């Protein structure tokens, strides 16, 4: 029976980065975070694009899907390093920088985000579809999304936001990422541009709507705004979402309301 | 024409930038590419479009961008106190000096990522940009640079034999060296059998430029490993080599990476 989050864990363990040499420990430095857990939303949503839209195709994006994580998981490395948020743990274990040290983890993050870029190229699709891809991934997960809301997160986490500003911020910190997974389900099944756009666009709002809720059942949208306010946002925005998206099909629409969880 | 203030000229026009209410991630962006650089890996790029197909010259300049890009995120990355602890680059204070660790480590993130977007616009069939991503990610990646960079990290406080000496240099600077001319054929779809031997040139000079330094030094090493009579000889001898696969390419382009090595030397 078809189960895509175990079919997308038994790729990636299939499919690890790995380098031989004499290294000691890179390799097992390179995998380790990307075996010791993960709920693979990014994944899981590309994956369902793809299963809802082209069935066919599923077993092709799973490499698309596996370069999604390895941008997801470089950033956490990253985000952990003492500089930023000096996290002891992730995902279960130590970080990087503590089983290691800082240069490893920093080298295994640089590794990652370049490797998403190899394992994308190196795809079961046509290179017109994989460059489509890689512009995505590009755009979202580099300076125009992913690393600007980072870098605003952590040079203003000693300052004030606006609500506009703090709604920027968290847009290109997380959203972005999750809107590129949706649109690049959609270039793989070659979707038609307005669908691919619209979908994208719900991206974004699901991708505020989920750090708005993880505020809640807690630059914080709860710090500005109160609890009772902070919720309104929230609600609105189911709200909106629901307008903009019943014009996505049924089986995309729920697959989709499940991984939200 | 003049390939090294065309790129230089292309590079100030094209530098990553994002609008957003963050007082210096652009400056940051651009700081250290506008700083300096000799450039050498976008000028073996574009000397062997220049050679071969120079109808797509202007093209290539964002395909040499992306090298330089990559290049420099290296830099940003290899200075941090974690790794080489360097307080100036290329003339300046490095990122971390003047600014932060955070924004050091972001920028150079920023600019790994954006090689890649970068290349994936330029105005080149979709086939040639996705052969030029493979060589790039490859030759930059965990096959080549990062785990050239890793080895000679955890390693520099221990001792290593010539083979995983000539192991660490291959990986940490040659095979972006040999990327660059590589990329330059696939642009010009060159052959595999000229572009491979090509890319073996790269190889070849990237080694020869490491001994280079390490006699320099005394002028892990190649000369400790070697000593000096046996270094200088290993690099004359490769120097001799490169100079047989020099005359194997268009005299045009074995003119224009003279230039480049003898400039480098």
Do not use: W
Not at 21 to 46: D, I, T, V, Y
Not at 70 to 78: A, E
Not at 147 to 161: H, M, T, Y
Not at 229 to 246: M, R, S, V
């Amino acid at each position: 029976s078809l189960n895509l989050k175990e079919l997308f864990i038994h790729h990636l363990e299939k499919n690890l980065p790995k380098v031989e040499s004499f290294h000691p420990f890179f390799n097992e430095a390179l995998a380790l975070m990307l075996k010791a857990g993960g709920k693979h939303f990014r994944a899981q949503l590309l994956l369902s694009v793809v299963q809802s839209n082209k069935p066919e195709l599923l077993n092709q994006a799973l490499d698309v899907a596996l370069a999604l994580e390895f941008i997801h998981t470089y950033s956490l490395i990253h985000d952990d390093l003492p500089a930023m948020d000096n996290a002891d743990f992730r995902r279960g274990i130590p970080t990087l920088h503590k089983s290691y040290d800082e240069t490893t983890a920093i080298l295994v993050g640089d590794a990652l985000n370049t490797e998403a870029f190899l394992v994308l190229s190196h795809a079961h699709l046509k290179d017109e579809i994989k460059i489509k891809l890689i512009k995505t991934l590009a755009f979202n997960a580099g300076l125009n999304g992913m690393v600007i809301g980072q870098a605003i997160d952590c040079f203003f986490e000693d300052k004030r936001l606006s609500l506009n500003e703090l709604e920027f911020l968290h847009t290109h910190k997380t959203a972005r990422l999750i809107a590129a997974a949706l649109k690049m389900g959609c270039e793989i099944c070659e979707l038609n541009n307005e669908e691919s756009n619209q979908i994208y666009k719900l991206g974004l709002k699901l991708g505020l709507i989920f750090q708005i809720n993880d505020d809640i059942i807690d630059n914080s949208f709860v710090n500005l705004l109160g609890l009772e306010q902070a919720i309104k946002t929230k609600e609105n925005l189911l709200n909106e979402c629901e307008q903009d998206l019943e014009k996505l099909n049924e089986k995309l629409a729920q697959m989709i309301q499940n991984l939200i969880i």
